[PDB]
Amino acid sequence: QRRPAGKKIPFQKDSFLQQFEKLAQSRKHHVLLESARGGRYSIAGLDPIATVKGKDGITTIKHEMLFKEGDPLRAFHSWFKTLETETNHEFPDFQGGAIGFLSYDYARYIENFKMLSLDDLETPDIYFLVFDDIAVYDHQEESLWLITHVNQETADVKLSELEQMWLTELPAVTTAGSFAAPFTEDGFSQAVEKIKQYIASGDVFQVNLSIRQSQSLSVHPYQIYKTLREVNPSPYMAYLETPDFQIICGSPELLVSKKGKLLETRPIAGTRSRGKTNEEDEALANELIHNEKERAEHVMLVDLERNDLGRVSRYGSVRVNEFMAIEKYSHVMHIVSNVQGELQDGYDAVDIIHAVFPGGTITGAPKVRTMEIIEELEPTRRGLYTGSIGWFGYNHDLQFNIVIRTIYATGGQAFMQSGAGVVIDSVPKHEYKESFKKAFAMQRALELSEEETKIR
Ligand SMILES: N[C@@H](Cc1c[nH]c2ccccc12)C(=O)O
């Protein structure tokens, strides 16, 4: 009977993140999910027991090498189910399993897509590193959980080996691809005009339209991640490294979580610079909350999320338990809603993803038509952008973010993507400036990291 076994040790955040970095430089495949500013857990994935890669109807699991045709997440889950475990309520939400991503283009197994946009990045549709051995930092308790899988004798030997690896002193740290043209300002602006025609003709109400920027990669991706983490920390940050791509994720948005039968999504209405006093934050938050246009856009997407959770929840169980609540941390304020449902029996991880992915807040309403319009207008596949990073538990819990504020590093480039909610009265130029301003945190992280390596 497979089960997690765990030991909790006192540990400081700085020590965890510093020891992670030094252990990680010897692992060709690794991942960090970090609560940089407002979450509870940071999860270190150093030594995978398996890697799962799904692209264009083929999944490979290297555990041995298994492969299967079809829906990659369905293939993953039929293998992953064999390693399932019972929850140990003493351990963190993540107590072992798969960490990685669903590409936006996993949506091509959920709905019928045309093949119009260029796949120039070659992003996997799904990519998971699977862990029997993990380290989970609890920010609340200042403890490190060391977790391994057994079946009591071999348990504590494995846990004492993990404890030694995390406590042993280590020294201080020390192929050009061919890519398509992103949108021009004119290209973007004409696609805005096309969306407005589709809204006027009743096809859609709102569409997230996005633009990709790229620059030469001259610094190690983990250096870029440390800069983004210092300047724009968020609760759903992630660093993922493989030999062929690296992910630098600064996301503050949850797509979906499952804790037992409880399903949760948290759509963000908008984000704002904090003031200097609480009275100033109240007034600056109220300006977003009291905006009738913004409120109505948000009500539309909350309703979309309810109909999404509705597809796998017990009828009449879907509720909005928080509506345009204020989430403050570091220099930033989020206006955010919380939608909940009770998972109906028979529905699994794959059914939940098909219901909620990709998120309503980075597509539009209604979602299926909106994705057809996005695929028709955008010159490139989104790949990881507005996909989801997260974890599937052996115990059938899960937690996925939305990939925004993210650098995808491949083939000598750093790719940055951002968008804007196009509505019936959108001004093309204003929506183009909005999407360009949203890439500022990534542009700055890259610029700060490069200048940092010039210091001699
Ligand atoms: N913030 C999450 C953990 C986490 C960090 N980064 C993530 C990225 C994706 C999913 C989860 C996470 C928590 O405290 O529970």
Ligand SMILES: [Mg+2]
């Ligand atoms: Mg707008």
